[PDB]
Design a protein around this nucleic acid. Sequence first.
RNA 1: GGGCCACGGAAACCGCGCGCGGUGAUCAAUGAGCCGCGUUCGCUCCCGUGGCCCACAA
RNA 2: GAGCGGCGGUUU
Lengths: 120, 317, 53
Amino acid sequence: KPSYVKFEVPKELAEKALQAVEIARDTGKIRKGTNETTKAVERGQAKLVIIAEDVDPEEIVAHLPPLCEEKEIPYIYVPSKKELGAAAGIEVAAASVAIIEPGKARDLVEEIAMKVKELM
Amino acid sequence: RILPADIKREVLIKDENAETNPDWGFPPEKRPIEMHIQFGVINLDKPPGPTSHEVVAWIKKILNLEKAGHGGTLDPKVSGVLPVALEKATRVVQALLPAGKEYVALMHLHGDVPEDKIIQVMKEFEGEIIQRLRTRKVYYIEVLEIEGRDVLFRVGVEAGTYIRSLIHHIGLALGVGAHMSELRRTRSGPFKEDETLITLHDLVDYYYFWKEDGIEEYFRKAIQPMEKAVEHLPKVWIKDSAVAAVTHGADLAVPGIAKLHAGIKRGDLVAIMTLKDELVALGKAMMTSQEMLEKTKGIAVDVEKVFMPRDWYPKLW
Amino acid sequence: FRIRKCPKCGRYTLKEVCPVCGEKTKVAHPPRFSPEDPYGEYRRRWKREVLGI
RNA sequence: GGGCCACGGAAACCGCGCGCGGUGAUCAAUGAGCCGCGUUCGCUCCCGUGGCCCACAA
RNA sequence: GAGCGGCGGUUU
Ligand SMILES: [Zn+2]
Protein backbone atom coordinates (compact mmCIF):
# COMPACT_ATOMS: atom_id res chain seq x y z
CA LYS A 1 0.00 0.00 0.00
CA PRO A 2 0.97 3.65 -0.89
CA SER A 3 4.16 5.14 0.55
CA TYR A 4 2.42 8.27 1.82
CA VAL A 5 0.37 5.89 4.00
CA LYS A 6 2.57 6.23 7.06
CA PHE A 7 0.87 3.65 9.37
CA GLU A 8 -1.69 0.81 9.70
CA VAL A 9 -5.21 1.76 10.70
CA PRO A 10 -7.89 -0.71 12.05
CA LYS A 11 -11.28 -1.13 10.34
CA GLU A 12 -13.43 0.27 13.14
CA LEU A 13 -10.98 3.10 13.75
CA ALA A 14 -11.24 4.05 10.08
CA GLU A 15 -15.02 3.70 10.47
CA LYS A 16 -15.13 6.16 13.32
CA ALA A 17 -13.15 8.44 11.00
CA LEU A 18 -16.03 8.54 8.53
CA GLN A 19 -18.42 8.93 11.47
CA ALA A 20 -16.77 12.07 12.85
CA VAL A 21 -16.72 13.45 9.31
CA GLU A 22 -20.34 12.45 8.78
CA ILE A 23 -21.47 14.27 11.90
CA ALA A 24 -19.17 17.30 11.74
CA ARG A 25 -20.51 18.06 8.25
CA ASP A 26 -24.06 18.84 9.34
CA THR A 27 -23.65 19.64 13.05
CA GLY A 28 -20.30 21.40 12.58
CA LYS A 29 -17.94 22.59 9.88
CA ILE A 30 -15.64 20.70 7.47
CA ARG A 31 -13.54 21.22 4.33
CA LYS A 32 -13.47 18.79 1.41
CA GLY A 33 -10.77 18.31 -1.19
CA THR A 34 -7.04 18.44 -0.84
CA ASN A 35 -6.87 22.16 -1.57
CA GLU A 36 -9.23 23.30 1.17
CA THR A 37 -7.77 20.67 3.48
CA THR A 38 -4.29 22.04 2.93
CA LYS A 39 -5.45 25.65 3.43
CA ALA A 40 -6.98 24.69 6.79
CA VAL A 41 -3.79 23.05 8.06
CA GLU A 42 -1.58 26.01 7.04
CA ARG A 43 -4.06 28.44 8.63
CA GLY A 44 -4.12 26.33 11.79
CA GLN A 45 -7.86 25.73 11.68
CA ALA A 46 -8.07 21.97 11.12
CA LYS A 47 -8.78 19.82 14.20
CA LEU A 48 -8.27 16.54 12.32
CA VAL A 49 -7.17 15.65 8.80
CA ILE A 50 -8.55 12.57 7.04
CA ILE A 51 -6.65 11.08 4.11
CA ALA A 52 -7.78 8.36 1.66
CA GLU A 53 -5.44 5.40 1.08
CA ASP A 54 -6.24 4.96 -2.66
CA VAL A 55 -4.94 8.31 -4.00
CA ASP A 56 -3.27 7.95 -7.40
CA PRO A 57 -0.93 9.86 -8.05
CA GLU A 58 0.59 9.87 -4.57
CA GLU A 59 1.81 13.44 -5.03
CA ILE A 60 -1.80 14.65 -4.63
CA VAL A 61 -1.79 14.03 -0.84
CA ALA A 62 1.83 13.09 -0.05
CA HIS A 63 2.65 16.56 1.33
CA LEU A 64 -0.17 16.14 3.81
CA PRO A 65 1.24 13.82 6.43
CA PRO A 66 4.48 15.86 6.77
CA LEU A 67 2.58 19.19 6.82
CA CYS A 68 0.32 18.16 9.68
CA GLU A 69 3.27 17.03 11.77
CA GLU A 70 4.88 20.46 11.29
CA LYS A 71 1.64 22.01 12.57
CA GLU A 72 1.15 19.17 15.06
CA ILE A 73 -2.30 18.35 13.68
CA PRO A 74 -3.57 14.74 13.99
CA TYR A 75 -4.43 12.83 10.83
CA ILE A 76 -5.91 9.48 10.00
CA TYR A 77 -6.22 7.31 6.92
CA VAL A 78 -9.47 5.84 5.63
CA PRO A 79 -9.71 3.07 2.99
CA SER A 80 -11.59 4.84 0.22
CA LYS A 81 -11.79 8.28 -1.37
CA LYS A 82 -15.30 7.51 -2.60
CA GLU A 83 -16.57 6.65 0.89
CA LEU A 84 -14.71 9.64 2.38
CA GLY A 85 -16.32 11.81 -0.28
CA ALA A 86 -19.85 10.63 0.48
CA ALA A 87 -19.29 11.35 4.19
CA ALA A 88 -18.25 14.91 3.32
CA GLY A 89 -21.64 15.58 1.70
CA ILE A 90 -20.58 15.49 -1.94
CA GLU A 91 -21.33 12.76 -4.52
CA VAL A 92 -17.88 12.81 -6.09
CA ALA A 93 -14.76 11.64 -4.20
CA ALA A 94 -12.33 13.35 -1.82
CA ALA A 95 -8.60 12.62 -1.47
CA SER A 96 -8.77 14.34 1.91
CA VAL A 97 -10.87 16.24 4.46
CA ALA A 98 -10.34 18.69 7.33
CA ILE A 99 -12.72 18.77 10.27
CA ILE A 100 -12.69 22.47 11.21
CA GLU A 101 -15.41 22.45 13.83
CA PRO A 102 -16.53 19.07 15.34
CA GLY A 103 -19.83 19.41 17.21
CA LYS A 104 -21.55 16.10 18.01
CA ALA A 105 -18.20 14.54 17.13
CA ARG A 106 -16.20 16.27 19.87
CA ASP A 107 -15.51 13.08 21.86
CA LEU A 108 -15.03 10.83 18.81
CA VAL A 109 -12.42 13.18 17.36
CA GLU A 110 -10.78 13.57 20.75
CA GLU A 111 -10.78 9.78 20.93
CA ILE A 112 -9.14 9.32 17.54
CA ALA A 113 -6.30 11.79 18.16
CA MET A 114 -5.48 9.46 21.07
CA LYS A 115 -5.49 6.14 19.22
CA VAL A 116 -3.41 7.46 16.30
CA LYS A 117 -1.08 9.14 18.77
CA GLU A 118 0.10 5.67 19.77
CA LEU A 119 0.68 4.52 16.20
CA MET A 120 3.38 7.16 15.67
CA ARG B 1 6.33 -2.18 -32.99
CA ILE B 2 9.15 -1.41 -35.39
CA LEU B 3 10.31 2.11 -36.20
CA PRO B 4 13.08 2.89 -38.76
CA ALA B 5 15.21 4.00 -35.77
CA ASP B 6 15.12 0.40 -34.57
CA ILE B 7 17.10 -1.07 -37.46
CA LYS B 8 20.16 -2.88 -36.18
CA ARG B 9 23.44 -1.76 -37.68
CA GLU B 10 26.65 -3.60 -38.39
CA VAL B 11 29.99 -2.13 -37.40
CA LEU B 12 32.62 -2.22 -40.17
CA ILE B 13 36.19 -1.91 -38.83
CA LYS B 14 38.61 0.23 -40.88
CA ASP B 15 41.75 0.44 -38.66
CA GLU B 16 42.09 -2.63 -36.41
CA ASN B 17 45.06 -1.07 -34.57
CA ALA B 18 43.44 2.19 -33.42
CA GLU B 19 43.32 2.71 -29.65
CA THR B 20 42.27 5.64 -27.54
CA ASN B 21 44.40 7.55 -25.08
CA PRO B 22 42.51 7.47 -21.76
CA ASP B 23 44.05 10.85 -20.83
CA TRP B 24 42.08 12.87 -23.36
CA GLY B 25 38.44 13.82 -23.39
CA PHE B 26 35.62 13.10 -21.00
CA PRO B 27 33.48 10.01 -21.76
CA PRO B 28 29.97 10.40 -20.21
CA GLU B 29 30.67 8.84 -16.78
CA LYS B 30 33.94 10.67 -16.24
CA ARG B 31 32.11 13.97 -16.58
CA PRO B 32 31.87 16.09 -13.40
CA ILE B 33 28.18 16.85 -12.66
CA GLU B 34 28.48 20.45 -13.95
CA MET B 35 29.98 19.31 -17.22
CA HIS B 36 27.28 16.60 -17.41
CA ILE B 37 24.56 19.28 -17.38
CA GLN B 38 26.33 21.44 -19.96
CA PHE B 39 26.10 18.48 -22.34
CA GLY B 40 22.91 16.93 -21.00
CA VAL B 41 19.50 15.93 -22.33
CA ILE B 42 16.44 15.29 -20.19
CA ASN B 43 13.93 12.60 -21.07
CA LEU B 44 11.08 14.61 -19.59
CA ASP B 45 7.61 13.19 -18.95
CA LYS B 46 5.51 16.31 -19.76
CA PRO B 47 2.30 16.69 -17.67
CA PRO B 48 -1.06 17.54 -19.21
CA GLY B 49 -1.78 21.32 -18.83
CA PRO B 50 1.15 23.64 -19.72
CA THR B 51 2.54 24.09 -23.21
CA SER B 52 5.82 22.49 -24.18
CA HIS B 53 7.37 26.00 -24.27
CA GLU B 54 6.24 26.91 -20.76
CA VAL B 55 7.54 23.66 -19.32
CA VAL B 56 11.00 24.50 -20.64
CA ALA B 57 10.92 28.02 -19.27
CA TRP B 58 10.17 26.43 -15.87
CA ILE B 59 13.15 24.09 -16.18
CA LYS B 60 15.39 27.03 -17.11
CA LYS B 61 14.30 29.22 -14.23
CA ILE B 62 14.45 26.44 -11.61
CA LEU B 63 17.70 24.87 -12.74
CA ASN B 64 19.39 28.19 -13.49
CA LEU B 65 20.08 27.41 -17.11
CA GLU B 66 20.78 29.94 -19.80
CA LYS B 67 19.59 27.74 -22.63
CA ALA B 68 17.47 24.67 -23.32
CA GLY B 69 15.33 23.46 -26.23
CA HIS B 70 12.76 20.71 -26.58
CA GLY B 71 12.16 18.41 -29.55
CA GLY B 72 8.69 17.74 -31.04
CA THR B 73 6.27 20.19 -29.43
CA LEU B 74 3.57 18.30 -27.58
CA ASP B 75 0.20 20.03 -27.28
CA PRO B 76 -0.98 21.35 -23.85
CA LYS B 77 -3.24 18.37 -23.01
CA VAL B 78 -0.82 15.74 -24.22
CA SER B 79 1.53 14.02 -21.74
CA GLY B 80 4.67 11.94 -22.28
CA VAL B 81 8.08 11.87 -23.85
CA LEU B 82 9.48 15.35 -24.32
CA PRO B 83 13.27 15.44 -24.91
CA VAL B 84 14.86 18.57 -23.36
CA ALA B 85 18.36 19.31 -24.60
CA LEU B 86 20.35 21.56 -22.24
CA GLU B 87 22.97 24.31 -22.63
CA LYS B 88 25.75 23.31 -25.04
CA ALA B 89 23.77 20.20 -26.12
CA THR B 90 20.82 22.34 -27.22
CA ARG B 91 21.38 21.93 -30.96
CA VAL B 92 21.13 18.13 -30.82
CA VAL B 93 17.33 18.33 -30.92
CA GLN B 94 17.87 18.84 -34.65
CA ALA B 95 18.67 15.09 -34.60
CA LEU B 96 15.37 14.24 -32.90
CA LEU B 97 12.92 16.59 -34.58
CA PRO B 98 12.98 14.27 -37.71
CA ALA B 99 12.76 10.92 -35.80
CA GLY B 100 9.77 8.59 -35.57
CA LYS B 101 7.27 8.88 -32.71
CA GLU B 102 4.92 6.61 -30.86
CA TYR B 103 1.66 7.36 -29.06
CA VAL B 104 -0.94 5.69 -26.93
CA ALA B 105 -4.23 7.30 -27.88
CA LEU B 106 -7.77 7.15 -26.60
CA MET B 107 -10.39 7.52 -29.33
CA HIS B 108 -14.07 8.23 -28.63
CA LEU B 109 -16.49 7.07 -31.36
CA HIS B 110 -19.64 9.12 -31.89
CA GLY B 111 -21.70 6.03 -32.70
CA ASP B 112 -21.83 2.26 -32.13
CA VAL B 113 -19.59 0.03 -34.31
CA PRO B 114 -18.77 -3.70 -33.92
CA GLU B 115 -15.35 -4.47 -32.39
CA ASP B 116 -14.27 -6.35 -35.50
CA LYS B 117 -15.04 -3.50 -37.90
CA ILE B 118 -13.08 -1.04 -35.79
CA ILE B 119 -10.04 -3.30 -35.75
CA GLN B 120 -10.41 -4.06 -39.43
CA VAL B 121 -10.95 -0.44 -40.47
CA MET B 122 -8.01 0.80 -38.35
CA LYS B 123 -5.55 -1.68 -39.88
CA GLU B 124 -6.15 0.03 -43.25
CA PHE B 125 -4.50 3.21 -42.06
CA GLU B 126 -1.02 1.59 -41.79
CA GLY B 127 1.18 2.96 -44.64
CA GLU B 128 0.74 6.47 -46.09
CA ILE B 129 -1.90 8.95 -45.02
CA ILE B 130 -2.65 12.47 -46.17
CA GLN B 131 -3.32 15.55 -44.04
CA ARG B 132 -2.46 19.19 -43.42
CA LEU B 133 -1.54 19.18 -48.32
CA ARG B 134 1.01 16.61 -47.17
CA THR B 135 1.74 12.91 -46.88
CA ARG B 136 2.98 11.00 -43.85
CA LYS B 137 3.69 7.38 -42.76
CA VAL B 138 1.91 5.28 -40.18
CA TYR B 139 4.39 2.53 -39.29
CA TYR B 140 1.94 0.54 -37.19
CA ILE B 141 -1.29 0.67 -35.22
CA GLU B 142 -2.37 -1.76 -32.58
CA VAL B 143 -5.70 -1.87 -30.82
CA LEU B 144 -5.11 -2.56 -27.16
CA GLU B 145 -8.72 -2.35 -25.92
CA ILE B 146 -12.22 -1.41 -26.94
CA GLU B 147 -14.93 -0.42 -24.46
CA GLY B 148 -18.15 0.46 -26.26
CA ARG B 149 -17.22 3.66 -28.01
CA ASP B 150 -13.77 3.94 -26.38
CA VAL B 151 -10.93 2.57 -28.39
CA LEU B 152 -7.45 2.51 -26.83
CA PHE B 153 -4.64 1.99 -29.30
CA ARG B 154 -0.95 2.44 -29.93
CA VAL B 155 0.34 4.00 -33.09
CA GLY B 156 3.83 4.51 -34.49
CA VAL B 157 4.32 7.37 -36.93
CA GLU B 158 6.71 9.61 -38.76
CA ALA B 159 7.64 13.06 -37.42
CA GLY B 160 4.92 15.67 -37.84
CA THR B 161 1.94 13.33 -38.10
CA TYR B 162 -1.10 14.69 -36.24
CA ILE B 163 -2.73 11.89 -34.29
CA ARG B 164 -5.83 14.06 -33.65
CA SER B 165 -6.39 14.28 -37.35
CA LEU B 166 -5.66 10.57 -37.87
CA ILE B 167 -8.35 9.72 -35.34
CA HIS B 168 -10.83 12.00 -37.14
CA HIS B 169 -10.26 10.18 -40.44
CA ILE B 170 -10.72 6.88 -38.66
CA GLY B 171 -14.06 8.32 -37.49
CA LEU B 172 -15.12 9.24 -41.02
CA ALA B 173 -14.17 5.81 -42.36
CA LEU B 174 -16.42 4.20 -39.75
CA GLY B 175 -19.24 6.60 -40.70
CA VAL B 176 -20.17 7.45 -37.11
CA GLY B 177 -17.24 9.87 -36.60
CA ALA B 178 -14.83 10.21 -33.65
CA HIS B 179 -12.60 12.50 -31.64
CA MET B 180 -9.39 12.03 -29.66
CA SER B 181 -10.11 12.29 -25.97
CA GLU B 182 -6.69 11.36 -24.58
CA LEU B 183 -3.14 11.38 -25.92
CA ARG B 184 0.28 10.32 -24.53
CA ARG B 185 3.60 10.21 -26.39
CA THR B 186 5.37 7.02 -25.40
CA ARG B 187 8.45 7.49 -27.59
CA SER B 188 10.43 9.95 -29.68
CA GLY B 189 13.51 8.72 -31.49
CA PRO B 190 15.84 7.07 -28.95
CA PHE B 191 13.78 8.47 -26.08
CA LYS B 192 11.32 5.93 -24.68
CA GLU B 193 9.47 5.05 -21.52
CA ASP B 194 12.33 3.60 -19.51
CA GLU B 195 13.80 4.50 -16.13
CA THR B 196 15.26 7.73 -17.62
CA LEU B 197 11.72 9.06 -18.16
CA ILE B 198 11.50 11.66 -15.41
CA THR B 199 8.61 13.84 -14.14
CA LEU B 200 9.01 17.51 -13.19
CA HIS B 201 8.52 16.80 -9.51
CA ASP B 202 11.36 14.31 -9.58
CA LEU B 203 13.47 16.54 -11.77
CA VAL B 204 13.23 19.50 -9.39
CA ASP B 205 13.51 17.44 -6.23
CA TYR B 206 16.68 15.65 -7.37
CA TYR B 207 18.06 19.00 -8.27
CA TYR B 208 17.49 20.28 -4.72
CA PHE B 209 18.85 17.05 -3.24
CA TRP B 210 21.98 17.93 -5.12
CA LYS B 211 22.13 21.70 -4.58
CA GLU B 212 20.98 21.86 -0.95
CA ASP B 213 21.68 18.40 0.47
CA GLY B 214 24.91 17.57 -1.37
CA ILE B 215 23.60 14.34 -2.95
CA GLU B 216 24.60 14.19 -6.59
CA GLU B 217 23.43 10.68 -7.46
CA TYR B 218 19.77 11.35 -8.29
CA PHE B 219 20.22 14.53 -10.24
CA ARG B 220 22.98 12.89 -12.24
CA LYS B 221 20.67 9.99 -13.25
CA ALA B 222 17.98 12.56 -14.18
CA ILE B 223 20.19 13.96 -16.94
CA GLN B 224 21.34 11.87 -19.92
CA PRO B 225 24.61 12.36 -21.82
CA MET B 226 23.94 14.15 -25.09
CA GLU B 227 25.30 11.03 -26.80
CA LYS B 228 21.89 9.46 -25.98
CA ALA B 229 20.18 11.86 -28.46
CA VAL B 230 22.20 10.19 -31.17
CA GLU B 231 21.66 6.43 -30.59
CA HIS B 232 19.45 6.08 -33.66
CA LEU B 233 21.91 7.67 -36.14
CA PRO B 234 24.56 5.86 -38.17
CA LYS B 235 28.01 6.53 -36.75
CA VAL B 236 31.60 6.82 -37.80
CA TRP B 237 34.19 6.56 -35.04
CA ILE B 238 37.39 8.51 -35.51
CA LYS B 239 41.00 8.26 -34.26
CA ASP B 240 42.26 10.58 -31.49
CA SER B 241 44.49 12.36 -33.99
CA ALA B 242 41.51 13.66 -36.00
CA VAL B 243 39.28 14.79 -33.17
CA ALA B 244 40.63 18.24 -32.42
CA ALA B 245 40.81 18.85 -36.16
CA VAL B 246 37.14 18.02 -36.58
CA THR B 247 36.20 20.19 -33.57
CA HIS B 248 38.13 22.97 -35.33
CA GLY B 249 35.90 22.71 -38.40
CA ALA B 250 37.94 20.32 -40.53
CA ASP B 251 36.09 17.90 -42.73
CA LEU B 252 36.70 14.32 -41.77
CA ALA B 253 38.99 12.63 -44.25
CA VAL B 254 39.05 8.86 -44.86
CA PRO B 255 42.38 8.41 -43.02
CA GLY B 256 40.73 9.53 -39.79
CA ILE B 257 38.23 6.71 -39.48
CA ALA B 258 38.65 3.73 -37.16
CA LYS B 259 35.20 2.12 -37.44
CA LEU B 260 31.93 2.99 -39.13
CA HIS B 261 28.37 1.62 -39.41
CA ALA B 262 27.39 -0.38 -42.46
CA GLY B 263 24.74 0.95 -44.82
CA ILE B 264 25.66 4.64 -44.93
CA LYS B 265 24.66 6.35 -48.15
CA ARG B 266 25.70 9.76 -49.52
CA GLY B 267 23.70 12.56 -47.94
CA ASP B 268 22.94 10.64 -44.73
CA LEU B 269 23.12 12.48 -41.41
CA VAL B 270 25.95 10.82 -39.45
CA ALA B 271 27.11 11.11 -35.87
CA ILE B 272 30.87 11.40 -35.53
CA MET B 273 32.14 9.59 -32.41
CA THR B 274 35.47 9.21 -30.60
CA LEU B 275 36.61 5.71 -29.67
CA LYS B 276 35.41 6.54 -26.13
CA ASP B 277 31.96 7.11 -27.67
CA GLU B 278 31.87 10.85 -26.99
CA LEU B 279 29.93 12.87 -29.51
CA VAL B 280 32.14 15.07 -31.61
CA ALA B 281 30.01 16.41 -34.35
CA LEU B 282 27.05 15.84 -36.66
CA GLY B 283 27.86 15.74 -40.33
CA LYS B 284 26.64 14.59 -43.72
CA ALA B 285 28.20 11.68 -45.52
CA MET B 286 30.09 12.30 -48.79
CA MET B 287 30.75 8.61 -49.25
CA THR B 288 29.01 5.30 -48.69
CA SER B 289 30.10 2.86 -46.03
CA GLN B 290 31.81 0.80 -48.77
CA GLU B 291 33.73 3.76 -50.20
CA MET B 292 34.96 4.93 -46.78
CA LEU B 293 36.08 1.39 -46.13
CA GLU B 294 37.89 0.71 -49.42
CA LYS B 295 39.47 4.14 -49.92
CA THR B 296 42.62 5.64 -48.40
CA LYS B 297 42.11 9.32 -49.33
CA GLY B 298 39.26 11.80 -49.59
CA ILE B 299 36.51 13.59 -47.64
CA ALA B 300 34.24 11.07 -45.94
CA VAL B 301 32.01 13.31 -43.85
CA ASP B 302 31.08 16.98 -44.19
CA VAL B 303 31.25 18.32 -40.63
CA GLU B 304 28.28 20.62 -40.08
CA LYS B 305 27.53 20.80 -36.32
CA VAL B 306 30.30 20.60 -33.77
CA PHE B 307 29.41 19.88 -30.12
CA MET B 308 32.70 18.85 -28.49
CA PRO B 309 34.80 21.72 -27.06
CA ARG B 310 38.09 22.43 -28.83
CA ASP B 311 40.25 21.59 -25.79
CA TRP B 312 39.16 18.04 -24.88
CA TYR B 313 41.71 16.72 -27.36
CA PRO B 314 45.16 18.14 -28.24
CA LYS B 315 45.84 19.69 -31.62
CA LEU B 316 47.54 16.54 -32.93
CA TRP B 317 48.07 18.16 -36.36
CA PHE C 1 -8.08 10.60 -16.90
CA ARG C 2 -8.73 7.17 -18.33
CA ILE C 3 -5.46 5.74 -19.81
CA ARG C 4 -3.73 3.53 -17.24
CA LYS C 5 -0.59 1.33 -17.03
CA CYS C 6 0.85 -1.85 -15.36
CA PRO C 7 3.83 -0.99 -13.18
CA LYS C 8 5.12 -4.63 -13.73
CA CYS C 9 4.46 -5.17 -17.51
CA GLY C 10 4.19 -1.65 -19.04
CA ARG C 11 0.86 -2.64 -20.62
CA TYR C 12 -1.47 0.31 -21.32
CA THR C 13 -5.05 -0.51 -20.39
CA LEU C 14 -8.36 1.13 -19.26
CA LYS C 15 -8.81 -1.58 -16.60
CA GLU C 16 -7.71 -1.48 -12.92
CA VAL C 17 -6.01 -4.89 -13.06
CA CYS C 18 -3.42 -5.66 -15.81
CA PRO C 19 -4.78 -8.29 -18.30
CA VAL C 20 -1.27 -9.62 -19.10
CA CYS C 21 0.12 -9.74 -15.52
CA GLY C 22 -2.77 -9.07 -13.08
CA GLU C 23 -1.17 -6.22 -11.07
CA LYS C 24 -3.12 -3.11 -10.04
CA THR C 25 -2.57 -0.42 -12.67
CA LYS C 26 -1.84 3.30 -12.29
CA VAL C 27 -2.92 6.47 -14.04
CA ALA C 28 -0.60 6.97 -17.06
CA HIS C 29 -0.30 10.78 -16.83
CA PRO C 30 2.19 12.56 -14.56
CA PRO C 31 0.73 14.69 -11.73
CA ARG C 32 0.28 18.36 -12.51
CA PHE C 33 3.21 20.55 -11.59
CA SER C 34 3.37 24.29 -10.96
CA PRO C 35 6.38 26.65 -11.06
CA GLU C 36 5.27 27.98 -7.63
CA ASP C 37 5.42 24.45 -6.14
CA PRO C 38 3.85 25.60 -2.85
CA TYR C 39 4.30 22.24 -1.07
CA GLY C 40 7.70 21.34 -2.55
CA GLU C 41 9.27 21.61 0.88
CA TYR C 42 6.90 18.99 2.27
CA ARG C 43 6.93 16.70 -0.76
CA ARG C 44 10.74 16.58 -0.37
CA ARG C 45 10.47 15.83 3.31
CA TRP C 46 8.36 12.75 2.29
CA LYS C 47 10.52 11.76 -0.66
CA ARG C 48 13.81 11.72 1.28
CA GLU C 49 12.25 9.34 3.77
CA VAL C 50 11.14 7.10 0.88
CA LEU C 51 14.56 7.26 -0.83
CA GLY C 52 16.68 7.16 2.34
CA ILE C 53 18.77 10.33 2.12
C1' G D 1 39.12 33.18 -49.50
C1' G D 2 37.00 28.50 -46.86
C1' G D 3 35.23 25.48 -42.37
C1' C D 4 33.65 25.72 -37.47
C1' C D 5 32.00 28.59 -32.76
C1' A D 6 29.46 32.98 -30.47
C1' C D 7 26.09 37.19 -30.73
C1' G D 8 22.17 39.54 -33.74
C1' G D 9 18.01 39.63 -37.54
C1' A D 10 11.92 43.76 -33.19
C1' A D 11 8.75 46.34 -29.32
C1' A D 12 3.97 47.52 -26.44
C1' C D 13 -1.07 46.41 -25.81
C1' C D 14 -5.72 42.55 -26.17
C1' G D 15 -7.51 37.45 -26.21
C1' C D 16 -7.54 31.80 -25.62
C1' G D 17 -5.21 28.01 -22.86
C1' C D 18 -2.59 27.20 -18.56
C1' G D 19 -0.63 28.19 -13.65
C1' C D 20 -0.76 30.70 -8.65
C1' G D 21 -3.71 33.46 -4.77
C1' G D 22 -9.09 33.99 -3.06
C1' U D 23 -14.08 31.84 -2.88
C1' G D 24 -15.57 26.28 -3.14
C1' A D 25 -19.81 23.96 -6.60
C1' U D 26 -26.64 20.01 -6.98
C1' C D 27 -21.77 13.49 -10.54
C1' A D 28 -14.98 18.31 -12.84
C1' A D 29 -13.11 18.54 -4.48
C1' U D 30 -7.29 14.84 -8.60
C1' G D 31 -11.44 21.84 -8.18
C1' A D 32 -17.31 24.07 -11.44
C1' G D 33 -18.27 29.11 -11.98
C1' C D 34 -16.43 33.89 -10.83
C1' C D 35 -12.68 37.75 -9.22
C1' G D 36 -7.19 39.21 -9.17
C1' C D 37 -2.04 38.31 -10.60
C1' G D 38 1.25 35.73 -13.43
C1' U D 39 2.54 33.21 -18.07
C1' U D 40 4.85 30.55 -24.11
C1' C D 41 11.16 26.67 -26.21
C1' G D 42 14.24 26.20 -29.67
C1' C D 43 16.23 24.19 -34.40
C1' U D 44 17.57 24.53 -39.90
C1' C D 45 18.72 27.61 -43.94
C1' C D 46 20.23 32.55 -45.52
C1' C D 47 22.44 37.72 -44.29
C1' G D 48 25.48 41.01 -40.74
C1' U D 49 29.39 41.63 -36.54
C1' G D 50 33.25 39.22 -33.85
C1' G D 51 36.37 35.02 -32.14
C1' C D 52 39.15 30.29 -33.40
C1' C D 53 41.38 27.16 -36.96
C1' C D 54 42.97 25.90 -42.19
C1' A D 55 44.06 20.10 -39.64
C1' C D 56 43.73 13.71 -45.62
C1' A D 57 45.03 12.30 -38.98
C1' A D 58 50.99 12.06 -38.82
C1' G E 1 14.37 37.30 -44.45
C1' A E 2 12.42 31.43 -46.23
C1' G E 3 11.22 26.68 -43.49
C1' C E 4 10.77 22.53 -39.30
C1' G E 5 8.64 20.50 -34.67
C1' G E 6 1.15 27.69 -35.06
C1' C E 7 -0.63 30.01 -29.25
C1' G E 8 -4.34 33.40 -31.59
C1' G E 9 -5.86 39.24 -32.48
C1' U E 10 -5.15 44.57 -33.04
C1' U E 11 -1.28 49.39 -32.98
C1' U E 12 4.32 52.20 -34.90
ZN1 LIG F 1 3.50 -8.21 -19.77
